[PDB]
Amino acid sequence: VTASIDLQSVSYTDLATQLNDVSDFGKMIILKDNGFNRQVHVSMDKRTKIQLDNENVRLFNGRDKDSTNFILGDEFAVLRFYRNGESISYIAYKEAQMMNEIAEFYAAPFKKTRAINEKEAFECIYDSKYPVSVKINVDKAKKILNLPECDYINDYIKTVPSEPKTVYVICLRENGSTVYPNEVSAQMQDAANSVYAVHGLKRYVNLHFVLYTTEYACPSGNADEGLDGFTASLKANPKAEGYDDQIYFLIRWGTWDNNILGISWLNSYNVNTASDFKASGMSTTQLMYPGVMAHELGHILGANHADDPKDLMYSKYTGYLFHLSEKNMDIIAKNLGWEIADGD
Amino acid sequence: PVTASIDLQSVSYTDLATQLNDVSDFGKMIILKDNGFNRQVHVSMDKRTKIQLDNENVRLFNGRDKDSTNFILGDEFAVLRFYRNGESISYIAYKEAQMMNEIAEFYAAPFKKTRAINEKEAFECIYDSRTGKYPVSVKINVDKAKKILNLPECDYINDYIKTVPSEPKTVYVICLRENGSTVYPNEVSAQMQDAANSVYAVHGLKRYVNLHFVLYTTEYACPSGNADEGLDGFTASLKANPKAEGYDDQIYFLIRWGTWDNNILGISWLNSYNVNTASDFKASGMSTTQLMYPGVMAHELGHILGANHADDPKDLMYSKYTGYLFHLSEKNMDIIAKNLGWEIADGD
Ligand SMILES: COc1cc(=O)n(C)c2c(OC[C@@H](O)C(C)(C)O)cccc12
Ligand SMILES: COc1cc(=O)n(C)c2c(OC[C@@H](O)C(C)(C)O)cccc12
Ligand code: PRO
Ligand code: PRO
Ligand SMILES: [Cl-]
Ligand SMILES: [Cl-]
Ligand SMILES: [Cl-]
Ligand SMILES: [Zn+2]
Ligand SMILES: [Zn+2]
């Protein structure tokens, strides 16, 4: 009997038991949903490392055709897959108090209004009572909640190895900000996978995300002023001494003035010349805006805004998570040590 | 390029986690330093063994054979254990201040009655270099600690009851915290690591098996202090447990902190696990997990895999408890490896 996950009752223990059994060779897992099943071949993601306040977070992938990824920490697990182009997440926290808190947090925006189609956008999942997970379709949720259109308008400021190079992405929880591990990890996973999908870049780089708290807080709602202050705080921080050549993000749950989702120094990271904390940006981590860190990481690696409305780098926020621009893909890969003669 | 280092005069959980979390597929050089001590170790992730303790993921790390160094890393704790001049030294660091304080008090308590003059070489609370008030880790030299403490002689006398693949076979080692028992994650994981490494060191057995340890609580408690009666009841509790249905072919340990009557450290069903015939929860045993008796789970796992008591006093399978963690008996090594699918023609 093939291993399975029942999406009508999926808990943290269910996801952890299955994902912890994934060996080097991968594992078939059936996702079961109202009598319809999806067989996914799950593998450990060996390219990316993540710590959130030193808590280890592991990533898992399906095959490209499976359009499925997982996240696993000691405290939470995530299953994220697509249906009719929409992003559906199952988020399960291990501790009952935290699972109850998370369920209330995600349910609260929907309680203000009373949608007739609320369950397809948001649903508390119970064991076959307190919730064991939540199901959120962020595309459907954004249509019900009628959120202000947060975009990427002026979200940037201008200024073959045998072993991939490790590049740390040092994320710093802004002073006074509260972020949720499932949300931060999802941004990190989408950011890393947007890079590996380009020109076989896992041969050149392995991204290592870490999360700490910083004393820095943006002095205003302005993203440009905030990024200026953030990069200045890194240069003056004794804790960052010796790491001026890594990538940095100031993260928060919310957004900046003019519904700016994030901002970064354009074309500020190159594997040979990285220095002076230039490769820095800021990003929201809220669930309803997947791919913001990926978009900002794209700018740091040199990607400009793209003309295809399905591109991660489109000037408007779309929810698409991959680079489609060949010009951007070449710029990003060249900044990470790739050359055309190396192929994909 | 400055080699990474661990300062054993101030080593904390954060120190060990940041170093071990930086270990890639290719390994990492780390210098262990202390007053009058240095060791350059090439650290690698242990990809053979998986561990969850109540679903908390625990990762193992190895040095080269000549480094005599291993590490354990969980979200809540980290361990560095190395051998120096024939003695086993562990640095145990818990992330949370409350738990680190509790752990430091727990390890210090046996020494507070026997106030030895040479206490620091056996046990020491380690503090941070800039502040320290509360300990960031504890150093325990088990061999020196056993000479200071008047511990009763705990042994293995009658601790056994006589009842190449391309991908290694996964074998779960399902450990169950006995009802009413309190165990510490650094202690349980050290027993698991030593047990797994005693198997892989024999006939290149990582080609045949990858051990996956899990820890849960059981409602079972031994009805008395008798290890034989305890093991009988434990194997019976597995056969009657609905949670274990479908897993009768895995390996099981009932674990506790303490020992059984007659200072018995553990017990197991001899020659009860074979990769082709494993069934009926036969591959089961019991093991202490206390820090001062490293290798008990390894010794009991040896018996489950068919190893008999060996005559070399340096063998893991010697009938007396020694603290040695490897099989030396060629007869035992062949029995264990054959029970895991190995054949002489396969080589090492
Ligand atoms: C507020 O900034 C930081 C806060 C903080 O706590 N730390 C530790 C920082 C930091 O350390 C990462 C470092 O240990 C590596 C990359 C080796 O894993 C580097 C840069 C910044 C910080
Ligand atoms: C008290 O015994 C048990 C308690 C308990 O909670 N569980 C889950 C047990 C169990 O499951 C292991 C299982 O999830 C696998 C091997 C897939 O990882 C097997 C055998 C026993 C137990
Ligand atoms: O995953 C589990 O088993 C529990 C159920 C609710 C909260 N977490
Ligand atoms: O459903 C849709 O159209 C959007 C586009 C990308 C993510 N989902
Ligand atoms: Cl929300
Ligand atoms: Cl800071
Ligand atoms: Cl039970
Ligand atoms: Zn942009
Ligand atoms: Zn024995």
3-state helix/strand/coil string of A30-76: EEEECCEEEEEEEEECCCCEEEECCEEEEEEECCHHHCEEEEECCCE
Q: Which of A321, A322, A339 is nearest to A330 (CA)?
A: A339
Instruction: Give CA–CA dist B157/A137, Å, rounded.
Output: 61
Secondary structure of chain B in HEC code, one letter for each residue: CCCEEEECCCCCHHHHHHHHCCCCCCCEEEEEEECCEEEEEEEEECCCCEEEECCEEEEEEECCHHHCEEEEECCCEEEEEEEECCEEEEEEEECCHHHHHHHHHHHHHHHHHCCCCCHHHHEEEECCCCCCCCCCEEEEEHHHHHHHCCCCCCECCCCEECCCCCCCEEEEEEEEECCCCCCCHHHHHHHHHHHHHHHHCCCCHHHCEEEEEEEEECCCCCCCCCHHHHHHHHHHHHHHCHHHCCCCCCEEEEEECCCEHHHECEEEECCCCCCCCCCCCCCEEEEECCCCCCCHHHHHHHHHCCCCCECCCCCCCECCCCCCCCCCCHHHHHHHHHHCCCCHHHCC
CA atoms B307, B309, B311, B317: torsion sign: positive
Residues A99 and A189 in one domain: no
Looking at the complex, does the CB of residue A46 fall below 8 Å from at least one CB of chain B? yes
**Pair B161, B256 in one domain:** yes
Query: Closest-CA residue in chain A for B59?
Result: A56
- Residue A292, by phi and psi: left (phi above 0), alpha (psi -120 to 50) or beta? alpha
Q: Is B336:B199 a contact under the CB 8 Å cutoff?
A: yes
Contacts 24+ apart (CB under 8 A), B60-67: B60/B189, B60/B193, B60/B196, B61/B20, B61/B23, B62/B197, B67/B39, B67/B41, B67/B42
Q: Is A337 helix (H, G, I), strand (E, B) or coil?
A: coil
Do B177 and B305 fall into the same domain? yes
Sign of CA dihedral B101, B107, B111, B112: positive
Amino acid identity for residue A36 in this structure: F
Q: Is B95–A54 a contact, with Cβ atoms under 8 angstroms apart? A: yes
Nearest to B218 by CA among B234, B198, B196, B206: B234
A155 is in an annotated binding site: yes
Q: How many Cβ atoms are within 10 Å of A277's Cβ, its own excluded?
A: 24
* Cα-based distances in Å from B28 to A51, A170, B17, B43: 18, 20, 14, 5
Give catalytic residues of A, as residue numbers.
Answer: 296
* CA gyration radius, chain B: 20
Q: A17 to chain B: which residues are within 8 Å by CB? A: 55
Residue indicated by tokens 């849960």: B216
Ligand 1 site residues (CB inside 6 A) read: A 168, 170, 172, 210, 212, 214, 237, 239-240, 243; B 18
Q: Which residue has the tokens 């008090």?
A: B105
CA A207/CA A295 separation, integer angstroms: 16
Task: Print burial letters for B143-169: b (CB count within 10 Å at least 16), e (below 16).
Answer: bbbeebbeeeebbbeebbbeeeeeebe
Q: Are residues B70 and B119 in the same domain?
A: yes
Q: Residue A141's closest CA among A319, A320, A323, A322?
A: A319
- Answer with the one of A119, A146, A173 that is the final residue of a domain: A146
Pair A161, A96 in one domain: no
- Return d(Cα A210, Cα A178) in angstroms, integer: 16
| Pair B50, B32: CB distance under 8 Å | no
- Pairing outcome for strands A262-266 and A247-252: unpaired
Does any CB of chain B come closer than 8 Å to the CB of residue A166? yes
Q: B114, B133, B150 — which closes off a domain? A: B150
> For chain B, after which residues does the C atom lie more than 2.5 Å from the next written residue's N, i.e. where is it broken?
131, 163
CB of residue B174 inside a 6 A radius of ligand 2: yes
What resolution in Å is listed for this PDB structure?
1.9
User: Which listed residue (B124, B178, B187, B300) is catalytic?
Assistant: B300
Please tell me the distance between residue B252's alpha carbon and the centre of ligand 7 in angstroms: 13
CA-to-CA separations, A51 to A54, A169, A245, B300, in angstroms, rounded: 5, 11, 19, 36
Count of positions (residues) in chain A: 344
Instruction: Give the residue whose CA is nearest to atom 3 of ligand 4.
Output: A85
Residue B258: other Cβ atoms inside 10 A: 14
DSSP A342: G
Q: Is A305 annotated in some ligand binding site? A: yes
Please report, as a single letter, which amino acid is at residue A100. N
Instruction: Considering only the C-alpha atoms of chain B, give the largest distance between any 2 of them, rounded to a whole number of Å.
Output: 60
- Provide the CA B276 distance to its chain's centre, in angstroms: 26
**Is the CB of B239 inside a 6 Å radius of any atom of ligand 2?**
no
According to DSSP, the residues that pair with B255 across neighbouring strands are B177, B287
Token pair of A250 as six digits: 């100031």
Q: Which residues contact A237 (CB under 8 A, 6 or more apart)?
A: A214
Q: What is the CA radius of gyration of chain A?
A: 20
Which candidate, B22, B156, B155, B11, places its Cα nearest to that of A51?
B22
Q: CB distance A206–B24 less than 8 Å?
A: yes
Cβ pair B79, B64 in contact under 8 A: no
A157 and A137 in one domain? no
Q: Tell me if A41 sits within 8 A of A28, measured CB to CB.
A: yes
Q: Is A267 in the pocket of ligand 3 (CB under 6 A)?
A: no
Instruction: Name the method of structure determination.
Output: X-ray
Q: Count how many Cα atoms sit within 13 Å of the Cα of residue A113 in the half-sphere of its side chain.
A: 14
**How many whole angstroms separate alpha carbon A123 and alpha carbon A125?**
6
CA of A121 to the centre of ligand 2 (A): 34
The Cα B150–Cα A311 span in angstroms is 71
Q: CA-to-CA distance for B118 and B109, rounded, in angstroms? A: 16
Most B CBs within 10 A among A1, A20, A50, A209, hence the mutation to make, goes to A20
| The one-letter amino acid at B194 | D
3-state secondary structure of A164: coil
- Give the integer Cα–Cα distance in Å for B290 and A278: 50
Per-residue b or e along B17-33, where b marks 16 or more CB atoms closer than 10 Å to that residue's CB: bebbbbbeeebbebebe
Number of neighbouring beta carbons within 10 Å of residue A107: 16
Q: Is A89 helix (H, G, I), strand (E, B) or coil?
A: strand
State how far residue B263 is from chain A, nearest Cα, in angstroms.
36
Tokens of A69: 């990824």
Q: Beta-strand (E) ranges in chain A?
A: 3-6, 27-33, 36-44, 49-52, 55-61, 68-72, 76-83, 86-93, 122-125, 133-137, 156-158, 165-173, 205-213, 247-252, 262-266, 280-284
* Phi and psi at residue A209, to the nearest 5°: -90, 140
Closest-CA residue, ligand 1 atom 6, reads A212
Chain A residues with CB-CB distance to B17 below 8 A: 51, 54
Distance CA A125, CA A118 (A): 14
User: In this structure, are B157 and B246 located in the same domain?
Assistant: yes
Tokens at A232, concatenated: 């200045």
How many angstroms separate the Cα of A130 from the Cα of each of A5, A11, A37, A136, B285?
Answer: 19, 11, 26, 17, 37
Helix (H, G, I), strand (E, B) or coil at A170: strand
Q: How is residue A331 written in tokens?
A: 């710029």
Q: Is the Cβ pair B24, A54 closer than 8 Å?
A: no
Whether residue B105 sits in one domain with residue B160? no
Judge whether A19 and B39 are in contact, CB under 8 Å: no
| Contact status, residue B93 vs residue B73, Cβ threshold 8 Å | no
Tokens 């001494």 label which residue? A241
The 3-state DSSP class for residue A85 equals coil
**Based on the domain organization, do B155 and B278 belong to the same domain?**
yes
How near does any CA of chain B get to the CA of A85, in Å?
A: 33
8 Å CB contact between B283 and B174: no
How many structural domains is chain A composed of? 2
In which domain, by residue range, is B196 found? 151-348
Please indicate, yes or no, whether residues B45 and B101 belong to a single structural domain of this protein: yes
To the query of whether residue B121 is one of the catalytic residues in this protein, the response is: no
Q: Which of B18, B48, B75, B167 to mutate to test the interface with A (most CBs of A within 10 A)?
A: B75
Ligand located closest to B161 CA = 9
Q: What SS3 class is residue A286?
A: coil
Regarding whether A8 and A131 lie in a shared domain, the answer is yes
Q: Is B83 near ligand 2, meaning CB less than 6 Å away?
A: no
End residue of a domain, out of A146, A166, A182: A146
A240 lies in the same domain as A99: no
